[PDB]
C-alpha cells in the first residue's frame, strides 16, 4: 500500500483510541511502508499494552514510537533497503 491510503486506517482506528492531539503520528505515517489491515490493528493495540506497565491511560508520544517497533518487525530494512537504486 502507498502512503495516502493508510491515513484512512490509522485515522479511523484512532477514533476508538484515546490519544492527545500532540501525538507524533504525523511523522510515522512516512515511516509506515508495506503493511496491511491486520498489522496496523496490532500497532494501536500495542500502544495501550505498554501504557499499562507505564501507568498511563491516555496514549502519549512515548507509547507510540516505542510500541511501533514491536509489530513492525519482518525484515531488517523493508524500506527501499539501503540505496542501490
Amino acid at each position: 500500500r502507498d502512503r495516502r491510503e493508510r491515513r484512512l486506517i490509522f485515522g479511523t482506528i484512532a477514533s476508538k483510541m484515546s490519544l492527545a492531539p500532540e501525538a507524533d503520528l504525523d511523522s510515522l505515517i512516512i515511516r509506515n511502508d508495506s503493511l496491511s489491515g491486520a498489522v496496523i490493528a496490532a500497532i494501536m493495540q500495542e500502544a495501550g499494552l505498554r501504557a499499562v506497565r507505564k501507568n498511563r491511560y491516555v496514549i502519549l508520544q512515548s507509547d507510540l514510537e516505542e510500541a511501533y517497533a514491536t509489530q513492525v518487525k519482518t525484515d531488517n530494512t523493508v524500506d527501499k533497503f539501503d540505496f542501490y537504486k
Binding site: 476508538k16 484515546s18 494501536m44 495501550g48 499494552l49 496514549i59
Partner: peptide
C-alpha cells in the same frame, strides 16, 4: 499484564480502547 490483568480487571483495556 496480558493474562492476569485482562482476566481480572478488563475495563483497563476498554478505557483505552484496545
Amino acid at each position: 499484564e496480558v493474562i492476569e490483568l485482562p482476566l481480572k480487571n478488563p475495563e483497563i483495556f476498554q478505557r483505552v480502547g484496545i
